[PDB]
Amino acid sequence: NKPADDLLNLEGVDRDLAFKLAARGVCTLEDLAEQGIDDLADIEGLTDEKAGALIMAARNICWFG
Amino acid sequence: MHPMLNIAVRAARKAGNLIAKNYETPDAVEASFVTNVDKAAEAVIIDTIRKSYPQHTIITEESGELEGTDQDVQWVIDPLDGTTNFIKRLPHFAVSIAVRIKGRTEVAVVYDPMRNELFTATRGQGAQLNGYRLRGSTARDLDGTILATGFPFKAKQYATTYINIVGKLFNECADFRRTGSAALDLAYVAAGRVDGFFEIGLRPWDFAAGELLVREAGGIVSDFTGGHNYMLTGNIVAGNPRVVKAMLANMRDELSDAL
Amino acid sequence: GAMAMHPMLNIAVRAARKAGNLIAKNYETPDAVEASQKGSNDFVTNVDKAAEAVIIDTIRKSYPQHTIITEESGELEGTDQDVQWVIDPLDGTTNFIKRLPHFAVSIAVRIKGRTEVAVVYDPMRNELFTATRGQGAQLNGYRLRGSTARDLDGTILATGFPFKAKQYATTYINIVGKLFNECADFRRTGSAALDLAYVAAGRVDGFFEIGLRPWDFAAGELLVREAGGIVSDFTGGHNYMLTGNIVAGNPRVVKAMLANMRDELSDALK
Ligand SMILES: [Mg+2]
Ligand SMILES: [Mg+2]
């Protein structure tokens, strides 16, 4: 369970976090846009404030071009 | 089985009983009034909560923030969602109760006392209607969809923006529903009775319970820009991820002109 | 008080309650519901057809001589041409398919083209709306008296979107926005027969919709009229009988709606 390049290349995602997301089935940038903050809870090192900023950035790229 | 859920249900059903008894009394047209039904329902709910959890904070529209010594737990209450419907004896209205712990919503109840429909959810455990598990709408885009909504009657400086948003969505969706209860609109998104919901300028007690029903039935909830600031702005979009994405994309150009 | 019942109203209520039972049983166990698409966003089920058969069977056991008119069967002509039963077996089929529990059975009886008795029945709430010409309208036996609004300020207007005739979309949206300058809010429920019953009961203050079919409003029109209201087309005339462009409410609400709408009307709506 590996991440895609559009997720690995998103600012603020380190390689560790990328692989932690892919472990939960969040493997691409478009998958990250579809999450709620609650879906990312209890990720070592990931605050709720950063979870929200990452999901917003994924939507800006994938949904709003 | 969550104990707090048990108490939230108990309070909602006691308030609903009282509302339904006042629904049977003569309305303003027939009479051609001293009992605030919202306030009497509010009192029943606060009494039921405090008899089990006297330390907790309670927040409602009629009373504002009643601070408790345990500020880590808040009950967020609409004692009667759908006041105009009740006044005209249109029998679509609800009691809404949400419990938030350390800033996260953990328990939700929306209770329709005229149909005896109890919508419940707890965080990480799913959502139910009268015991049956809810899974939301299967729509993959807006083709053929029914969107619930409300008009900005409390904020008419936004009337033109809102009418423009409705008109553009209507070229993609099939129809709309305007019921008069945001709490039940969100419950109906969770049940798949409508395919999504949007409204401007709601207050936290309007949607605090309904938004957890949606998310526990597979949906997402966002603000009108796609962010997570809806608890602060009260501009709500809700539905499954494909429906929400399509709604936000459709609306975006009009929002830019407004700002 | 002493209760009574007109004989044709008795049979209309019997037919609507039997069809309504069948509809509600299929709602609770929809494993056998089969939907089919008529036209644009317009559906018909096997439940619709079974309810229609129940209504026709009930009418014909007591009045085999009378004509019956429905959408799916057309005009079933009878030997007594003075009387016509005008039926909608299930109004609100999109709500029914989605399990949104707001739908109804509508039955009107006309003598020489004039409505004499009417029934609109909600089988999920068990709400029976009835009317007899010259004798008033009722909900579950209680007499209806409409809304007391004197103009559009503070009013709640029921409406339907032109989801089956979207060539009217731009004009309809303009009419809604202009009405919103004066009224308070709208309701969009998905049953036109129940929207007209709610005007009669004062649960909303008025109603407007483009292009309804005759069985959509035949019964609801008599409910509105027997509770003190009027029905007109979008210019205040009588052509709604031919176009289905309907405005309904008490006389002062309808006058105010028509004055607001006048300058937004397209040629097709004139
Ligand atoms: Mg309220
Ligand atoms: Mg029908």
Numbering used by the authors:
A (entry chain C): 428 to 492
B (entry chain A): 1 to 32, 39 to 265
C (entry chain B): -3 to 266
Paper quotes:
Ribosomal RNA synthesis in Escherichia coli involves a transcription complex, in which RNA polymerase is modified by a signal element on the transcript, Nus factors A, B, E and G, ribosomal protein S4 and inositol mono-phosphatase SuhB. This complex is resistant to ρ-dependent termination and facilitates ribosomal RNA folding, maturation and subunit assembly. We show that SuhB directly binds the RNA signal element and the C-terminal AR2 domain of NusA, and we delineate the atomic basis of the latter interaction by macromolecular crystallography. The SuhB monomers are folded as an alternating stack of three pairs of α helices (helix pairs I–III) and two β sheets.
To begin elucidating the structural basis underlying the transcriptional functions of SuhB, we determined a crystal structure of a SuhB-NusAAR2 complex at 1.65 Å resolution. An asymmetric unit of the crystals contained two SuhB molecules and a single copy of NusAAR2. The AR2 domain formed a dual helix-hairpin-helix motif with four α helices and one 310 helix (order α1-α2-α3–310-α4), as observed before in other molecular contexts. The SuhB monomers formed a near-C2-symmetrical dimer that closely resembled the previously observed dimer of an isolated SuhBR184A variant (rmsd 0.66 Å for 491 pairs of common Cα atoms). In the SuhB-NusAAR2 crystal, two symmetry-related copies of NusAAR2 were bound laterally at equivalent surfaces of the two SuhB subunits of the dimer, i.e. below one exposed edge of sheet I and along the exposed lateral face of helix pair II, sheet II and helix pair III of SuhB. However, one of the NusAAR2 copies associated with one SuhB subunit via a flat surface formed by its C-terminal α3–310-α4 portion (interaction mode 1), while the other AR2 domain bound the second SuhB subunit via an edge formed by its α1, α3 and α4 elements (interaction mode 2). Interaction modes 1 and 2 bury about 650 Å2 and about 500 Å2 of combined surface area, respectively, showing that interaction mode 1 encompasses a more extended interface between SuhB and NusAAR2. Moreover, superimposing the AR2 domain of a αCTD–NusAAR2 complex on the AR2 domains in the SuhB-NusAAR2 crystal structure revealed that SuhB bound in interaction mode 1 would preclude αCTD–AR2 interactions, while interaction mode 2 would allow formation of a ternary SuhB–NusAAR2–αCTD complex. Thus, only interaction mode 1 can explain the mutually exclusive binding of SuhB and αCTD to NusAAR2 we observed. The analyses were again consistent with interaction mode 1 representing the relevant complex, as SuhB mutations affecting interaction mode 1 led to a reduction of more than three orders of magnitude in the affinity to AR2 (Kd = 141 μM for SuhBKL251/254AA-AR2), while a SuhB mutation affecting interaction mode 2 only had a mild effect (∼4.5-fold reduction in affinity; Kd = 435 nM for SuhBK108A-AR2).
